[PDB]
Amino acid sequence: EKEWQPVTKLGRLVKAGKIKSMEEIYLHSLPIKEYQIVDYFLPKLKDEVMKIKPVQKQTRAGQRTRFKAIVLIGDSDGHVGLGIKTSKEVATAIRAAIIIAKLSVIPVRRGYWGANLGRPHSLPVKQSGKCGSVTVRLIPAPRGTSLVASPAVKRLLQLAGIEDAYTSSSGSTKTLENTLKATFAAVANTYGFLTPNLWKETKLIRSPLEEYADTL
């Protein structure tokens, strides 16, 4: 409720306003372990729960029931993530799920189909990912078409900021947890593809942690 005490060195620097934006963290690829960092840089992040499914376990007296919740978040402007956590109580699981989702927020790369006229709307290349017998493929599309996909993966692409795309699915897509995790991996790899316009050499600079001095 009241003001938080940073526990890691990165958290202290964020509280003092010594770093510009979250992309500075992304550039040096530093781990994030405190959910107050993300919402300090990215307000108006929407959250929306997918579904809850019970899970059983057999014991001598009877069967033990727990509840599993799936939650994904995004800002519709290039940031998205999801988290899954199970607990003995429905309400408790949802609260913990939102925290895990914030910790995993990642940026997306959005490009053009053909000619460029500002405000990129689609994926730069075609990318795909696999998570346990489910494969999802994304294809760039011309401006004007909407998102062509199942309701499950259309929501995730909506919150990532991607506007136009083509989709293809394989395997047992009825496993909702596996499908979302495969889509999340495909979008995450957009910045991992080396297009010719990125061939230019970059200058290496020291990380914020090394060149700043923290408080006691």
Binding site: K46, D47, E48, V49, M50, K51, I52, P54, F67, V71, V90, A91, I94, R95, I98, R155
Partner: peptide, 21 residues
């Protein structure tokens, strides 16, 4: 069967927000 507390949650947004007649 987690449908008991959806009437007055207001702490999360569901996929298909159940419209009431």
């Amino acid at each position: 069967e987690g449908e008991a507390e959806l009437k007055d949650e207001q702490a999360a947004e569901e996929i298909a927000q159940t419209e009431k007649k």
